[PDB]
Amino acid sequence: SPEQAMRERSELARKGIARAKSVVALAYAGGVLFVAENPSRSLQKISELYDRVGFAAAGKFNEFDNLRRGGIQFADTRGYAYDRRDVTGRQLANVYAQTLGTIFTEQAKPYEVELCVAEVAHYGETKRPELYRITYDGSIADEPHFVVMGGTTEPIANALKESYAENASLTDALRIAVAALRALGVASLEVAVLDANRPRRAFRRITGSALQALL
Amino acid sequence: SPEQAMRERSELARKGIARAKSVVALAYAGGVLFVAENPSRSLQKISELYDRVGFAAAGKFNEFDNLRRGGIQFADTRGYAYDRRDVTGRQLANVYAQTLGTIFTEQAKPYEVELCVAEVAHYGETKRPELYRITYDGSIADEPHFVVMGGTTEPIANALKESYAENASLTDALRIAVAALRALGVASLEVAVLDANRPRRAFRRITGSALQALL
Amino acid sequence: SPEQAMRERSELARKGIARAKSVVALAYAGGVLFVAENPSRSLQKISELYDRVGFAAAGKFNEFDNLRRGGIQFADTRGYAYDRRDVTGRQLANVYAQTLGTIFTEQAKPYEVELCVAEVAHYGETKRPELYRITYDGSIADEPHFVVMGGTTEPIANALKESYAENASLTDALRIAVAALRALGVASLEVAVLDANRPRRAFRRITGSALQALL
Amino acid sequence: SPEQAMRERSELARKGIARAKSVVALAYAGGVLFVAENPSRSLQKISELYDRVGFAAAGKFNEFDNLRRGGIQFADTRGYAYDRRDVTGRQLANVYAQTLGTIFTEQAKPYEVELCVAEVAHYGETKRPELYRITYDGSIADEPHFVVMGGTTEPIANALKESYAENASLTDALRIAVAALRALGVASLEVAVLDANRPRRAFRRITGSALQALL
Amino acid sequence: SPEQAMRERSELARKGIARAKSVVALAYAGGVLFVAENPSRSLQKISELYDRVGFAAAGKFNEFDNLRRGGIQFADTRGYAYDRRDVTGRQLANVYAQTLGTIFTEQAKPYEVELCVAEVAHYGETKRPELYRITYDGSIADEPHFVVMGGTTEPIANALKESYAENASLTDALRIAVAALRALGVASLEVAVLDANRPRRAFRRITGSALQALL
Amino acid sequence: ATIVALKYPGGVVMAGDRRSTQGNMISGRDVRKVYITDDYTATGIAGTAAVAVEFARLYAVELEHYEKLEGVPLTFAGKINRLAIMVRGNLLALPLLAGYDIHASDPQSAGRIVSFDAAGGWNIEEEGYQAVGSGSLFAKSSMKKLYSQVTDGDSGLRVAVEALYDAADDDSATGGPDLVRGIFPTAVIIDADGAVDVPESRIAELARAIIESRS
Amino acid sequence: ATIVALKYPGGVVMAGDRRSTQGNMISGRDVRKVYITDDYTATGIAGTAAVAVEFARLYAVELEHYEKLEGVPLTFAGKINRLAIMVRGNLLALPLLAGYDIHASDPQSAGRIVSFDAAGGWNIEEEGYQAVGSGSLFAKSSMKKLYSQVTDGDSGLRVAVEALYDAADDDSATGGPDLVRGIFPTAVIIDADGAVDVPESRIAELARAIIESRS
Amino acid sequence: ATIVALKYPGGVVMAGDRRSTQGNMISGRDVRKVYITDDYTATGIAGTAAVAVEFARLYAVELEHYEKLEGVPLTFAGKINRLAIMVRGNLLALPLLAGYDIHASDPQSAGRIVSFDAAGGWNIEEEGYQAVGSGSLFAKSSMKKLYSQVTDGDSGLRVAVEALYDAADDDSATGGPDLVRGIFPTAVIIDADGAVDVPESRIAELARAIIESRS
Amino acid sequence: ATIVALKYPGGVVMAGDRRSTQGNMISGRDVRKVYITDDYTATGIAGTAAVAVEFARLYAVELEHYEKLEGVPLTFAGKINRLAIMVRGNLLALPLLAGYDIHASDPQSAGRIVSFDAAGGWNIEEEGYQAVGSGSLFAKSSMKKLYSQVTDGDSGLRVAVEALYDAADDDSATGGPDLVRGIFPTAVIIDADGAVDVPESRIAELARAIIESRS
């Protein structure tokens, strides 16, 4: 009875994911904003995959750390093989979806992780940011505005659907994301951005007095 | 009891396929028309396999993306091995049927996908278009007029059986397909054709103001 | 309890075979006549294995297409190895029986196919035609007059046991086979013969106005 | 519970063997006489293994054909390795017993076959013929006078225990075997002998007018 | 529940062994006497392993024939590797115990065999004979006087415990063993000795008029 | 040895000599070096009979294998591709290919000649004639002057025989017409109706006429 | 053989000779050494026709495979990277690459020339012209003086034809204009609208004008 | 050593010398170099006795293996194919094959001679005689003049013995008739009734008559 | 070193020298080069003691392994086959084999001598004597004149000792009788009762008599 096994695995994965904290991604005027609750400085849930590709995850740290390392290795190999412009968010999202589906199908215990991949336009180019959401069983969706993962996401989803404006500022977006997450100072918070105005490397980490000044 | 397992797998595959959207293929005077509902620009369900061979699928994106990539690789290898005229829709349909049957038999979870392969005559030749339908368990059928896959296909099947005319125009066929699918503007729609009047590459994508003008 | 599993597999194979169409083979004066109901021109159930060896099958197309390809490859290899006269219907029937038995024993799901192998005498030689029947579990039988496979074979078997004459003509045999199958014009019918009067290649396909004239 | 599985496999093998026809072997003055009911000329249950070694089997044709081929290959290899006099009936019986035991133990479905190996003295030598019986689970027994395999063997066993004489003639032994089997003309009968008076190859097949004259 | 499986396997092995005939070994003044009931001349249960090592077994012939061949090969390899005096009964008993334990543990069906290994002193040396008993699950025991294997061994064990004398003669020991086994002429009996007075090869087979004269 | 092929309106002709030597000693007298490998294709290898016949057999087997597997003969472009794979795998003498293109727009310009260089690369001749072998230079120089007289099949055959005679006149490794033994060169003519061997009497008469004219 | 490529405002031109020789003997007369492998890219190999055509076919297949898999054509930087992998794997004659960069900031300075050295390393030409082959030195020395006259496509074509003529004047392995047979060099022009082959009449007129001027 | 085979109406004869040497020293005196490997086939290798006997044994084993496996002897075309595989695998001295074709249309023209060159390619002789070995040239030159006297088996045997004598007269590595020790060449005659060895007395009388005539 | 073997009515004798040298320096004085490897078989290798003893040990182990496994000693034809496999695997000095055939029809003509050439092929001697080693030529030339005096075992032993003396007289690498140290050649006699070593006193007396006669 494959239906019973599939339902039990889905329930286990949902229970595992729902116990994790909430990480949210926003698309403001200058790129993509990542906000997460990280009480530990040593462990991080937001990282960098390539020049214009970001990474965010929620769930067991060891399960998505390996996925992040594999994605970084794959992006580096593909960039060195063809060119640096070959690597895009679509390919990383697709390979992550295939890997998650294979883990869900063949492995004994499914991964209790949620994945988000964000891409920004190259320097001197105009293009709307792209956000992708990968679900534990391999499902892939495209989110035009924002992605909310981890925990009770419904109240935060409603709080973000309301009072959301395009082409906002970094400070305004940061306050909106913080208010949505609360529905929280320098500590227990992790903020990273994908600045499209950077020449080559768009990933940038905000931590310290700069975050307090922005807040 | 293999019968119980086979019935459960078939029920799971049918339930998975029935939740997907509807994609329809039509055979008009100038080739084969593909119409699908695609709210995401990034993800596509209609692609190209060879010079005169098309591809269309419905279901989980990750499951048929791999099949499309494998079919493209196989077609390229066979074309480089013998000749460019060796590759036909029959061989691709047969290999897809064998792959789907093997997945259904040996793999733990069956693929919830529906496959359609369409071929057109070469330049300067007269031959009726061929349409093939591959079902998840490996079943293969030949459809002379149209193929409907995904979702509640019965109302669309009746709406296409009625008011269908051979040797129609591109615009008339597009309107007929849209009306059948509704039983829907530039957005949330994907249209591709296989133009037999092209010298070598018959696949062509219609997107933008051209689609609105045709509509 | 191997008995229960064997009975369930046999029941599944019989149910799968019984849903397929009927293909019949006749031994007239000039060779072997193959008649089958094939509404699709693209898919064929009657093919050629070697110079004087034919092939006929009923059931799932993908399951016996692979068997036909393997038999053709084996016949070609054996002919190139020893000589062209080495290949006979007995060896092909035996290898098909071994393959079907192995599939039934080890594979998860048995093949729902029925196989018939017919051979004719070489040019300038006198020898009665040989007909073999291979059943899904590997059973092999020798049929002196005719083989009926697929569907409700009992009424056709009785209709062929009655009003059957040796050393008949091609037209008379064709009418007898058509009447037995009905118990059906150019379309939805596939006719092939093994003409013993041919020098080297005995297989011949009748399709088009010739079939109507013969009918 | 290995006992239940062993009993079920033994019952399945006995049921499979009991549906087959009866083949009997007799030891007359000039060698070993093999009589079997073979309505098909193409398929044979009696063959030759080496110069002075015979073979007889009852059951599924495909199951013992492979055993016969393997025994022939093994005998040829052993004869080419050491000498032609190395090969004896004991070694073939032992290897057949090991193969049957391994098939019964490890394979999913046991072989429903019965094996008999007969040997005769070399030219210009005096030695009583040897008969061996190999049973499906690997059991080996030595039969001084006759071996009966296949079908309801009890009535034939009693009919052969009564009215059996040593150093009989070929015709007398043939009539005795035919009468025992009936408890049947040129057709539906297969007769082979192991003539000890032959210089090198003792196997000889009797078929046609010679069999009728002997009968 | 490993206990249930172990008990079922032990019961199956005991049932298989108890149906076999009885073979007994005696230690007289000149070596070791082996007596067994062998109605078939072709099959033998007593053989030779090395210069001063014997072999005896009871149960299925095919199961202990392979063990005897493996022991002979191992003894030959060890003798050629280090020296001829390296090989002793202890090493053969130990390797047989390990092999039987591994078969009992990993293989699906345990071996229904009983093994006995006897050794004698070298030429011109004084040393009491050694007898070892290997049981199907790998258990090893040392028997100072006699070993009884196969069938209802209790009555024979009591009959041998009574009226047994050390340093007896060959004829007296043979009569004692025959009387114990009966609790039987030249036929249906196999007698072999390990004569310590032989220079190099101690194994000797008694068969024919010599056995009758000794009896 | 020398093989010459030249094009005429509506077809192509091929011919070769009948001499094989080991240095300065004549080895064969009636060596055949031109073979028909398809209905519209012939090949020729300058060398021993065994190599040429094996090459022709392998090419015919490959072509027939593809024909039986896919049900349609290969295109002329695909036939050359498979031949080059065989030539590259072998490496040696190099083959010469001549055939008819039935899919060409102009039937009168359908004959083709293909040559392989030492490196194994294939080239399509455009000068209308080609010769390979040791006497290739003399034959080509003769055809250079004699090609203006070719207007039909008979004229082309005469010119080919004259080219062979001229090549044999200046090379000791090429044999000329044998008017004592009666061994003349073999020729093959390919046209719209297929490839056919030329009878030896027309070859003989043309050779006799050329010899008489040269006197 | 010699292949010359030079840049003109708004595009680039490429041309090659039509001679292939085996040392001091002429092998071919109409060898084509320049091929179009993409919409904005052409390649040329100085050597036999077979090697050049196989290289062009392989490069086109690779480019089209990437194009079909990822849906977007490779960047010019990525096209060179894949070509160098093919050159390194092969090792031989070295290729010459000319193409148009449609993503360049300045359309008038978009033509590119790429050369590979003996070691397989690729270099981008900055002097505006490049020649490869046996007569490369003479052609380059001619373009050194004639490059000041290039102002458009026609001027560049004239200068390229003159460079080929000068290279053929001093090298015996390069063929000049054939005014008796009518075989002139082939040229390819790549601009913003794509790569197109130059008609033979304009080539012929330019060659005739150059020859008349040289007299 | 020299082996000579010549054809006569209704059969073929084969003979060889009885000398083996290591350079200038005689090694053997009664070496046998012709063996019977089938009922209608004999072979001969010019060399040491061991190599020839091993080759004959291997060929006989291969032929008998096929005969026992398939129940029918190989055709003459298939016999040559298997022999060439053995020759190619070994590489050395080269074998000579002579046999009778019982399926030939004309019984009087059924004898066959097969020769293998240094490269391993097989050729069928059409001149009626063939000789291999060191003295092959002298024997062939003798048969060239003596072949007009062959009209039956006895004439062919006389001519073969005379050819062997002539070959031994001019070569020191070939032995002539030994009238002191009584060692004469061995001969084999193959006809419709099978291959038989010629008795030594008829060989002796023919050698004596030839020697007397030469004096 | 030299090993000589000659046949006498009812048996065969073998003897060898006792010298081993490294070029011009004597290495050993009592080297034994003849060993008994079976009850009816002895072998001898011309070389160092270690190689000969290892070869004899390996041959004895192989023979005893077969004897123990199959219960019957190998035939003489099978003994030679196994020895040749060992010789071929090693490649070196070549062995000499002498034995008694107990299954021969004539007991008086049962002695056998087997020799291996450089290539490893075995030959059966028919001249009644054979010698191997550096002084083989002198020993054979001596036996050529002295073989007429052999009528029993003692005569054969005398002739063998005389042959060894003659071989040592002309070769510096072969040692003659040492009448100061008391080291004489070793001899082995094989007859119907088995192979036995000759005592050193009879060797000594024969050597002394030969030396006295030579003075």
PDB file of N, CA and C in Angstrom, chain I residues 127-156:
ATOM      1  N   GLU I 127      61.883 -45.415 -31.053  1.00  0.00           N
ATOM      2  CA  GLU I 127      63.167 -46.037 -31.349  1.00  0.00           C
ATOM      3  C   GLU I 127      63.725 -46.837 -30.177  1.00  0.00           C
ATOM      4  N   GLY I 128      63.071 -46.795 -29.017  1.00  0.00           N
ATOM      5  CA  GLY I 128      63.449 -47.612 -27.885  1.00  0.00           C
ATOM      6  C   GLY I 128      64.395 -46.967 -26.895  1.00  0.00           C
ATOM      7  N   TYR I 129      64.962 -45.806 -27.214  1.00  0.00           N
ATOM      8  CA  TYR I 129      65.855 -45.120 -26.292  1.00  0.00           C
ATOM      9  C   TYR I 129      65.777 -43.621 -26.541  1.00  0.00           C
ATOM     10  N   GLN I 130      66.080 -42.847 -25.502  1.00  0.00           N
ATOM     11  CA  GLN I 130      66.042 -41.395 -25.588  1.00  0.00           C
ATOM     12  C   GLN I 130      66.961 -40.811 -24.527  1.00  0.00           C
ATOM     13  N   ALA I 131      67.656 -39.733 -24.884  1.00  0.00           N
ATOM     14  CA  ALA I 131      68.563 -39.052 -23.972  1.00  0.00           C
ATOM     15  C   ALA I 131      68.345 -37.550 -24.069  1.00  0.00           C
ATOM     16  N   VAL I 132      68.404 -36.875 -22.922  1.00  0.00           N
ATOM     17  CA  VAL I 132      68.266 -35.427 -22.850  1.00  0.00           C
ATOM     18  C   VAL I 132      69.412 -34.868 -22.020  1.00  0.00           C
ATOM     19  N   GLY I 133      69.740 -33.608 -22.268  1.00  0.00           N
ATOM     20  CA  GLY I 133      70.805 -32.916 -21.571  1.00  0.00           C
ATOM     21  C   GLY I 133      71.849 -32.389 -22.532  1.00  0.00           C
ATOM     22  N   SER I 134      72.962 -31.928 -21.958  1.00  0.00           N
ATOM     23  CA  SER I 134      74.059 -31.405 -22.765  1.00  0.00           C
ATOM     24  C   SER I 134      74.813 -32.508 -23.496  1.00  0.00           C
ATOM     25  N   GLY I 135      74.958 -33.676 -22.876  1.00  0.00           N
ATOM     26  CA  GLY I 135      75.649 -34.790 -23.496  1.00  0.00           C
ATOM     27  C   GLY I 135      74.700 -35.795 -24.114  1.00  0.00           C
ATOM     28  N   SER I 136      73.514 -35.325 -24.507  1.00  0.00           N
ATOM     29  CA  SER I 136      72.499 -36.221 -25.052  1.00  0.00           C
ATOM     30  C   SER I 136      72.945 -36.837 -26.373  1.00  0.00           C
ATOM     31  N   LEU I 137      73.646 -36.066 -27.207  1.00  0.00           N
ATOM     32  CA  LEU I 137      74.052 -36.565 -28.518  1.00  0.00           C
ATOM     33  C   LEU I 137      75.009 -37.745 -28.391  1.00  0.00           C
ATOM     34  N   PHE I 138      76.020 -37.620 -27.526  1.00  0.00           N
ATOM     35  CA  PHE I 138      76.980 -38.706 -27.350  1.00  0.00           C
ATOM     36  C   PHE I 138      76.312 -39.946 -26.769  1.00  0.00           C
ATOM     37  N   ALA I 139      75.435 -39.760 -25.780  1.00  0.00           N
ATOM     38  CA  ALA I 139      74.739 -40.896 -25.187  1.00  0.00           C
ATOM     39  C   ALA I 139      73.859 -41.599 -26.212  1.00  0.00           C
ATOM     40  N   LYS I 140      73.132 -40.830 -27.026  1.00  0.00           N
ATOM     41  CA  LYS I 140      72.283 -41.430 -28.050  1.00  0.00           C
ATOM     42  C   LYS I 140      73.113 -42.159 -29.099  1.00  0.00           C
ATOM     43  N   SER I 141      74.244 -41.576 -29.506  1.00  0.00           N
ATOM     44  CA  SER I 141      75.111 -42.247 -30.468  1.00  0.00           C
ATOM     45  C   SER I 141      75.699 -43.530 -29.895  1.00  0.00           C
ATOM     46  N   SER I 142      75.955 -43.566 -28.586  1.00  0.00           N
ATOM     47  CA  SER I 142      76.444 -44.792 -27.963  1.00  0.00           C
ATOM     48  C   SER I 142      75.348 -45.852 -27.906  1.00  0.00           C
ATOM     49  N   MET I 143      74.139 -45.457 -27.497  1.00  0.00           N
ATOM     50  CA  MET I 143      73.031 -46.407 -27.461  1.00  0.00           C
ATOM     51  C   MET I 143      72.684 -46.920 -28.851  1.00  0.00           C
ATOM     52  N   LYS I 144      72.925 -46.118 -29.891  1.00  0.00           N
ATOM     53  CA  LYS I 144      72.670 -46.579 -31.252  1.00  0.00           C
ATOM     54  C   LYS I 144      73.443 -47.856 -31.558  1.00  0.00           C
ATOM     55  N   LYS I 145      74.692 -47.940 -31.098  1.00  0.00           N
ATOM     56  CA  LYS I 145      75.484 -49.144 -31.318  1.00  0.00           C
ATOM     57  C   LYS I 145      75.255 -50.197 -30.241  1.00  0.00           C
ATOM     58  N   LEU I 146      74.913 -49.787 -29.020  1.00  0.00           N
ATOM     59  CA  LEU I 146      74.822 -50.728 -27.908  1.00  0.00           C
ATOM     60  C   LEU I 146      73.416 -51.269 -27.663  1.00  0.00           C
ATOM     61  N   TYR I 147      72.415 -50.853 -28.442  1.00  0.00           N
ATOM     62  CA  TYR I 147      71.051 -51.299 -28.181  1.00  0.00           C
ATOM     63  C   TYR I 147      70.803 -52.737 -28.617  1.00  0.00           C
ATOM     64  N   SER I 148      71.660 -53.295 -29.473  1.00  0.00           N
ATOM     65  CA  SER I 148      71.478 -54.669 -29.923  1.00  0.00           C
ATOM     66  C   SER I 148      71.780 -55.694 -28.838  1.00  0.00           C
ATOM     67  N   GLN I 149      72.376 -55.278 -27.722  1.00  0.00           N
ATOM     68  CA  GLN I 149      72.763 -56.186 -26.652  1.00  0.00           C
ATOM     69  C   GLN I 149      71.758 -56.224 -25.509  1.00  0.00           C
ATOM     70  N   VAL I 150      70.639 -55.517 -25.626  1.00  0.00           N
ATOM     71  CA  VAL I 150      69.664 -55.428 -24.546  1.00  0.00           C
ATOM     72  C   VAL I 150      68.651 -56.554 -24.705  1.00  0.00           C
ATOM     73  N   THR I 151      68.583 -57.435 -23.705  1.00  0.00           N
ATOM     74  CA  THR I 151      67.615 -58.526 -23.701  1.00  0.00           C
ATOM     75  C   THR I 151      66.851 -58.666 -22.393  1.00  0.00           C
ATOM     76  N   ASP I 152      67.260 -57.999 -21.319  1.00  0.00           N
ATOM     77  CA  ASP I 152      66.573 -58.073 -20.035  1.00  0.00           C
ATOM     78  C   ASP I 152      66.916 -56.811 -19.248  1.00  0.00           C
ATOM     79  N   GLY I 153      66.481 -56.760 -17.986  1.00  0.00           N
ATOM     80  CA  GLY I 153      66.721 -55.578 -17.174  1.00  0.00           C
ATOM     81  C   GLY I 153      68.188 -55.308 -16.908  1.00  0.00           C
ATOM     82  N   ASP I 154      68.962 -56.355 -16.609  1.00  0.00           N
ATOM     83  CA  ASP I 154      70.381 -56.182 -16.317  1.00  0.00           C
ATOM     84  C   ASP I 154      71.152 -55.691 -17.537  1.00  0.00           C
ATOM     85  N   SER I 155      70.855 -56.245 -18.716  1.00  0.00           N
ATOM     86  CA  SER I 155      71.497 -55.774 -19.939  1.00  0.00           C
ATOM     87  C   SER I 155      71.163 -54.311 -20.209  1.00  0.00           C
ATOM     88  N   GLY I 156      69.897 -53.929 -20.024  1.00  0.00           N
ATOM     89  CA  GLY I 156      69.521 -52.536 -20.200  1.00  0.00           C
ATOM     90  C   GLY I 156      70.219 -51.614 -19.220  1.00  0.00           C
TER      91      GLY I 156
END
